[PDB]
Subunit: 243 residues, 7 copies
Amino acid sequence: PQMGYDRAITVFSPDGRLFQVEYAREAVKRGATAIGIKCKEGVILIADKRVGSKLLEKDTIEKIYKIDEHICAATSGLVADARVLIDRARIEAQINRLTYDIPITVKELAKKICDFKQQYTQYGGVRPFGVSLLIAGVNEVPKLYETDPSGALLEYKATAIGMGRMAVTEFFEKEYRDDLSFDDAMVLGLVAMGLSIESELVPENIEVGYVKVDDRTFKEVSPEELKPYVERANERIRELLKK
Amino acid sequence: PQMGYDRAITVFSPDGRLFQVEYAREAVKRGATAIGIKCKEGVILIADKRVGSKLLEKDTIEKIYKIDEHICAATSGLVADARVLIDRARIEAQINRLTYDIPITVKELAKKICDFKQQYTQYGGVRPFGVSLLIAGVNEVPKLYETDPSGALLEYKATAIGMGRMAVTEFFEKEYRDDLSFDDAMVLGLVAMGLSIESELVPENIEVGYVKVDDRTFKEVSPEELKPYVERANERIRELLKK
Amino acid sequence: PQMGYDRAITVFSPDGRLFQVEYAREAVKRGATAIGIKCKEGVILIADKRVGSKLLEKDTIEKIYKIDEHICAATSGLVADARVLIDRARIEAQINRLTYDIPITVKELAKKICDFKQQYTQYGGVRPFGVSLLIAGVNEVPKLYETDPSGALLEYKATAIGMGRMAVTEFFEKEYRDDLSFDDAMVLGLVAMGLSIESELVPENIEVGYVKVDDRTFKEVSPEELKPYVERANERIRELLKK
Amino acid sequence: PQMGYDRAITVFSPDGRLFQVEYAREAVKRGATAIGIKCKEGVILIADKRVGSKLLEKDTIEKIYKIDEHICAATSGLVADARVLIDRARIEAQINRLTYDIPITVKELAKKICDFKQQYTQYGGVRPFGVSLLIAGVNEVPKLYETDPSGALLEYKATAIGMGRMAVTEFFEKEYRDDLSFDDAMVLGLVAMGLSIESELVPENIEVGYVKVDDRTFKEVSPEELKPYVERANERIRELLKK
Amino acid sequence: PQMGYDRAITVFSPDGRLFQVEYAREAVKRGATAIGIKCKEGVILIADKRVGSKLLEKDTIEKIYKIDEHICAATSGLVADARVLIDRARIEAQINRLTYDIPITVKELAKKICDFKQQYTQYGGVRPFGVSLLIAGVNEVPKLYETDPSGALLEYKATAIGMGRMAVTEFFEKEYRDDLSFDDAMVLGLVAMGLSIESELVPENIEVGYVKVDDRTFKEVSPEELKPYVERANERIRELLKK
Amino acid sequence: PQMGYDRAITVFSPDGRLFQVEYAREAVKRGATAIGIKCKEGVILIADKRVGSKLLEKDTIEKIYKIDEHICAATSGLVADARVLIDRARIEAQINRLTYDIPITVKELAKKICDFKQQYTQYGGVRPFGVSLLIAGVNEVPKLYETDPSGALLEYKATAIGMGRMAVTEFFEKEYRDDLSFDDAMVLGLVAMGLSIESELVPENIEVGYVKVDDRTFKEVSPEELKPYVERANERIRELLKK
Amino acid sequence: PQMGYDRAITVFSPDGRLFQVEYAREAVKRGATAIGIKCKEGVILIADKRVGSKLLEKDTIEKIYKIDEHICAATSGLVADARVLIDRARIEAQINRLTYDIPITVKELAKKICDFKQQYTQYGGVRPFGVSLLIAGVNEVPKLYETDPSGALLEYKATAIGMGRMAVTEFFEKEYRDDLSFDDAMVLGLVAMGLSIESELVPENIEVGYVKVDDRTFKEVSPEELKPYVERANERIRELLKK
C-alpha cells in the first residue's frame, strides 16, 4: 500500500505486487456474503439477501444466478461489474453448445471467465472487475470454484466471499467434513451464514440454490422447503452464538 | 474522497471505491426530483417541472419520456447525458421488435441501458454518464427500476431520484402500502413531491405519466384530470407541512 | 472552480460538475450578443455585428446563418468552432432530405447538433465546442432553440447568448408578451439589443433574419426595411436608457 | 497566461480560453509582415522579403504563393507549417475542379483551409499550425481573407499579418479608402510596409502579387514595373517618417 | 531501485535497467519453489504443493502441467498470469502439429513463449507477465529450460524457481553430477526441495512429473511410487539438516 | 529554453516556440560540417570525413549520397535518423519515375522530405528527426537546398550545416561571388572547410560530389582529381589562417 | 544525464541528446564481450562464453549465431531483446531469397535490422532495444558491422562490444594490421579477448565462428581446432599481462 506504485494496474510495486488488484479486492469485501459448499451428492450456494429498505422489490432480488442447466453462480463486489460477468458466463455457455455441440463444464466456464478477467489486468486503459464469483455445478462430479478480480481461479470443497468470508472460512475450517450429506452440507452452510451475521436466520432473507449429481439440474429452494433447514440451523447458531 | 485516487474512473481507491462514479452521483443529486410508485393496477411516474424563468417554453418541457407503448422513463443529472440515454433506450426498444419480433420487457430494457452505462465505467478515455433513471412499465406485472451512473440496477415498489430523494424515500418508507390503489398511489406520490418541495402542489408545474395493467399503454395525465388529485394531495401536504 | 478537477473534460468534481464545460461556457460569454424572439406569425434572430475596425469587409460579415429554407441560426463563442458547427448543421439538413426525402424539423436539427456536442464532452482526447447556438425556424409552428457547449438543448419564446444575455434576458423577462405581433416582437428585440449595448441602434451594425409561418422561408432584412424599426426602437431605448 | 491551463490545446482556462492557440499566435507575430489590400479593380498582396544574409538564394525566395489561376496567398509564422498549409490549399483547389468540374472560390478555399486548422485545435495529440494566412483572389468580386492558428476566418478590405500588423493596421485604419484605385491601393500598400519597417522601400526586397477583376489571373510584379510605385511610396514614407 | 525510472516498463534507468522487469521478478520469488533436474535418461520436475488450508481441494491442485505428450512445465509468480502462459504454450503446441504436421520441440516451445513475454516488455500500455517457467521435455535429448519475466531463456542441467531458488541452486551447485541416474537425479531433486523447506518431505505435499528418453511420454508419479524416493531423500535431508 | 514548455513537441511556449525542435537542432550542430556551393555550371557538395580512429573502414565511409542520377545530398545530426531520411529520399525519387514516368526535380524531392519531417513535428507520440540536409542537383538550373529538423526548407547559393556552419557562412558571406566558375566555387568551398577546421586540408579526409548543368549526372571526385584543388585551397587557407 | 529530459525516448535534451538511447547503451556495456576482426581471406567473430555456474547447460550455449550460409552475428545487452533481433535477421534473410530469389548481402541485412531498431527510437509507447550487434559475413569481400541501440550502423576492420570494448579497441588500435592473415587475425583476436579478461584463455570458454572468402560458408571452430590458436595467444597474453 505504497503511493507511487498503486494507481496504475500495469505497474508492479518494488516488492512485486499489483496494488490496483488488491484494491479491487477491497470492493468485493463490502458485498453481501455468499457461501459455497460441496458434498458427495451435489453442490450448494447460499447468499445473504437482506435489504436495508422495504421499498426494494426484494421479491425479485437474485443473488444466485443460473448460468446453464448444470452451472450455478454467486457474486460479490461492484454490482454493475458483476451483472456483466454473469451475462458473459451465460453467453460463454451458449457458445460452447454451438461450437462443440455439448454443454460446457464448470471448470471450463470458470476458466474462461477468469481468463477474461486476467486481461483486464494487464493493459493500460483498462480497469479490473471489482468482483469475485463462486461458480458451482456438476460435471462428472460436483464442482465449486472461487474467482478473484485478478483472474485467479481456485477449487474448494467449501468457502465464501464478501463481508463474512473470514468467519465462514474459519468455521468451515474447523467443522467441514469431506463426507457430509446434502442435508448436512445444507445445514452446515446455513449455520456458517448465521455466525457470519451473528444472528439466527430468517429463511426469507437468504437465497439457496444447488445442483445434485442425479439431476445435474440447477434449482432454487423455496423458503418453505428451506424453513425446516433454517430451524435446525438456528438451533446450533443459537447454541454457538454467545454461550 | 481522497485526492490521488479520485480523478480517473479506472482507478480503485485503497478502500475499494470508484470516486469518479461517486462524484458522478453528485450530479444527479442536483436534478429536479422524479418519483416512481408502483401498485396493484399499474406504475406511476411523477416529475417536478417547475422552471426558474417564464421565457422557457415550458408548454413543451418533458420530464417523463415514453420509451415504447408500455415502457416509461424519468431522468435526473446532466441534461445532455440524459437525452442521449433516452434515445438509446428507444433505439434499444426498436431493435428488440426487429430481432425477436416482439416488444422488449421493462427488465430487459433497464438491463441493457445499465450494461451500457457500466461500460463507460471501466475504460480510460471515457466519462461515466452523470445520470440516474427511473424505468417504469408493465410486462406481466407492473415494474419500477432505478438506475445509477455506475450501471447498477434495482427494482423498487416506490422510490425517487434527484434533490428530494431523501425526503420522498423516508416518507414512502413510513407510509407506502403494498396494497394501495392506483388513485391512492397517485395521491401518495403527489404528497411525497409536496414534502420534497415543502409546498402545496400546482398541477401545472408537475408532470405525471403511468402504465396500467389493463391497457399496458403509457399515457400522460392532463392538468385537468390531475387537478382533483392535487387538491386531495395538498390537503395532507398542508396537514403535514408544519403542524 | 477548484484546481485538481478542472483540467480534464472527463473528470467530475467532488460536487458533481464538469468544470471544463463551465469554462467552455466562459468562451461564449465573450461573443457579440445574439437575440432570438418568437411570436405568433414567426421567429426572429437579431445579432450585433459592430466591428472594431474599418478594414474588415463588414459588407460580407454574417452573424445569422441560413441552415435550410426554413431553418435559421446564430452563434456565440470560439469563431472557428462555430463555423464548423454551422456547416455540420447544413450537412445534417441535406442528409435528412436524402434519407427521409423530406426537410428536417428545427427540433431534430437542434437535437442532432446537440448530440454531436454532447459527445465532445465524454471522451478523453477531445475538447468541447466553445460555443452556443440559437436555432430558429418554422415547422408546424415557430421554433426557437438555445444550445450549450455541453450539448444541452432548451426551447424558448425569447432569449439571448453572448455578452448581453443577462441584460436582454431580464428585459424580456419583464416585458415579453406571449401574444406580441411580428413587428412588436421585432421592435422589442431591437430594444433589448439596445439596452444590451447601452446605446441607440444603428441599422447598419445589426443583422436581422426571420422565418414566418406563411412562407416558411428564411430571409434577411435590409437596413432599409430595417431602418423604420430601429427608429421606433431607439425611441424607447432612449426613453429607458438613463431616465 | 496562467500555468496549469496553458500546456494542452484541449484544455480551457477558467476564463474560457485556449492558451496554446494564443501562444501559437505568438509565432506568427515573429514573421516578416505581409500586407493585403483590396480595391474596386482587384486585390493586392505585398510581402517583405528582406533577408539577413547574402548567402540565401533570395532570387528564388517566395513570399506570395499562387494557389490557382485566380487565388493568391501570403504567409506568417512557422516556416514548415506554412509550406504544408499552402500545398494543402493547392491540392484543395485541384480537388474542386475534379469534383465540381469548376474552379473553387476564394471563400471556399479559405474556408476549407480554416476547417482543417480548426481540427488541429480540438484533439489531444495534435499541435495547432503556428501560422496565419492572407488568401486573396477574385471570384465575382475581389476577395481578401485573413486566417488564424485557431481556424478563425475574417474578410477584410485591407489588413496585415506578422511583425508589422499593428503599424500597418493603424495606418490603413486612418487612411484606407473604400474607393481607392488599383494604383492608389498599390501605393498605399507600399507606404504601409514603409511605416512598418520605418525605412524607405527597396523594390528588390519586397514582393508584390495581385489579381484584377478583368483577367482573374494572378501575376507577380517585376521590380521594374514596381520601381515607379516604390518611388512614389518612398516620397510619402519619407514625408511621414519623422517629420 | 531509483524512483523516477521504475514505474514504466518502457523506460531505461540511467544505468541501463528495466526496473519494472526486476520488480516483476520479485513476484516469482514469492511462489512455491519448483525444481528441475536433467539426467542421461530423462528430465524431472518437482514442485512444492503444500497448502495453508484444508479447505482447498488439493486433490486437484496441479503444479506441473503437461503441454504436449513430450513437453512438461512448472510455474512460479502471479497465478492468473501463469495459467494464461500455460494455455498459450498448449495452443502453441497444437499450432505446430497443424503447420508442420509434427510435434514442436522443447526448445521451440520455450522460445515461442519467451518471445511472447519479451513483447509485453517493450510497449507502453502493457504489463509484463509476473512469472517464470521451467519447460522440460525430450526431443532427441532431454531438455530443461528456465524462463524469465523479461523473456530471457536459459538451458540448465538442474535449477529452480520460486522461494527456494537460492538454496536449491547452491545445493545442486555443490553436488549435481553430469552423469547421475534417473533415480539419483530424482532423489537429489527431493533432497534439494528438502533443504529448501528445511524439513523432511511428505510425498503427498510435493508433485513430480518427468519425461524419459525411451517413452518421450510425460507422466506424473503417484505418491505410492514416490514414497520410496522420499524415504531415501529424507534420510540425507535429515543427515544434512542441522548436523 | 524554459522548463515546463520544452519536453513535448506539441507544446508551444508562451513566446510561441517549439523548444523540442530547437533542441533537435542542437543535434545537427554536433555533426561533421557539410558545405554546399552553387555556381553557373553546377552545384558542389563538400563534406568532412575525418575519423577519430583508424579501425573504421573509412575507405567505405560516405558523407555525400546519390539520391538519383541528378540529385545529390549531405547530412548532419543523429546518424540513424539521417540514413532513414536518405533512403526515404531515394524511395521518393523512384516513386516519381513510376507515377509521372519522369525524374523528380530537386525542389520537389526536398519539398517531399521536408513535408515528411514537418509531420514528425505536430503529433504527440512522435520524435522529430534530429538532422539537417543539403539537397543538391540540377533541374533546368543548378539547385542547393538546406533542410531543418522542423521541416523548413530554404534555397541557397552557398551554405553549410554542422559544427562549422557559422565559420563557413560568414566566410561565404564575405567572399561568395554570384558569378564564380566551377573550379572557383570548388576552391572557395575547400577554403571554407579549411577555416572551419582551422587547418590545411588533406584531400583524403574530405569528400566532394557535384552535378553540372551539362551532364546532369552526379559524380564523386577522386582524391587524385581533388589534390590539385586542395593544394590551391591550402594556399589561401594558409594565407588566412593566422596572418 | 539531466533529469527532466531522460525518461522518454521521444524527448530531446536541451543539448540535443536522446538520453534513453544513451541509457540503453549502458545495457550492452554489461554483456560478455564479443570481438570482430576482418582480414584478407575472411571475417572472424570471437565471443566470451564463461558462465558463473556449472548448472548451466553451457554445452548448448550460443554466443555467435548463423543468420544465413554466409552471414554471421554476435550479441551484447538485454538477453531477450537480443534473441528477438537475431530471429528478425534470419526472417529478413529468408524474405530476401523469396523476393529477389537471391541471398541478402551483409550490408543489406545489417541495414534492415538497424532501420528496425531506429523505429523503436522515435515513437512514444515504445522501448528501444537494449543491444548492440556484430554482423559479419562475406559478400564480394569480407564484412564486419557494428550496430547500436539507436540504429546507427558502422563498418569496421576490427572492433568489439560489451564489457571489454575499451580494452579490445585500444589494443587493436595499436596493433591491428590491414594485411594480417586469417591465422594472424585469429590469434590477434584471442589476444584481445585475453587482455579484455586479464587472463590466459581457455579454448572451452570462448566461442569462435568465421566466414572465409573461398567458401562463403559460416562455420564454428571446435575447441580442438581452436586449442593451437589459444596456446599461441596465451603466450603473448602472458607476455603482455603484467610484464
